[PDB]
Amino acid sequence: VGSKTKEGVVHGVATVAEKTKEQVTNVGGAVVTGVTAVAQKTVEGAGSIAAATGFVKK
Amino acid sequence: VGSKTKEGVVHGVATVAEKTKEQVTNVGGAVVTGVTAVAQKTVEGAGSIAAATGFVKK
């Protein structure tokens, strides 16, 4: 009878990075460099998992 | 009877990167460089998983 329910889920992940140089040179604005294995289950809202959301104005 | 339900789900992932140089040189605006194995189950909202959402104006 048990109902098995799964939403916004990330599992069984195995990342391997090999980097000599990772440079981010930002001058103003917004930057989102690296996002791995993240989850969010929002209700009644504006959700942004990995988003550079620049409200740049005068 | 159990109903097995799965929504916005990412599993069984095996990433292997090999990078000598990863450079991001941003001058204003928005940048979203790398997104791997992410999940989001939003309800009643404007969802953006990996989006550079630049409201750049005067």
Place this chain on the structure above:
Amino acid sequence: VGSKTKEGVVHGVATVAEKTKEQVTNVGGAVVTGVTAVAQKTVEGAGSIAAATGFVKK
């Protein structure tokens, strides 16, 4: 009787990258470089998985 339901789902992924140089040189605007194995199940909203959504205006 159990109903097995799956929506916006990504599984069993094996990425292998081999890069000497990955450069992104952005001057204003929006950039979305790399998106792998992501999921989103939105309800009643405007969803953007990997989208450079530039509202660039004066």
Place this chain on the structure above:
Amino acid sequence: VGSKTKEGVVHGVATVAEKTKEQVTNVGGAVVTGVTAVAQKTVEGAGSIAAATGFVKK
């Protein structure tokens, strides 16, 4: 001038298995089930990376 030399080498591997049942039912002899991403650089000898080498006799 540097000489870059590589022998019996395995790199940049990303395995993803999804198995409900893996059974090995052996009755005597030799069994080698699973070998992934292995290396051996032998010198002056009889090398066997993944070999069922049964010397079965009376």
Place this chain on the structure above:
Amino acid sequence: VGSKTKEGVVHGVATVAEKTKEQVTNVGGAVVTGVTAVAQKTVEGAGSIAAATGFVKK
């Protein structure tokens, strides 16, 4: 001038297994079930990385 030398080498590995049942039912003999990302650099000998080497006799 530096000489970069690499022998019997395994690197940058990302394994992901998902198993409900892995059974090995052995009755005598030899069994080698699972070998991942191993290395051996032998000199003047008989090397066996993953080998069921059964000397079964009377």
Place this chain on the structure above:
Amino acid sequence: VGSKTKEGVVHGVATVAEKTKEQVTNVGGAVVTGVTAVAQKTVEGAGSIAAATGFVKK
């Protein structure tokens, strides 16, 4: 001038296992179930990294 030398080497490993049942039911003999990310650099000898080496006799 420095000579960078690497032999029988395993590095940068990321294992992820997900097992409900792993059973080994052995009745005599030899069993080698699981070997991950091991290294051996033997000199003047008979080396066995992961080997079921059964000298079963009467």
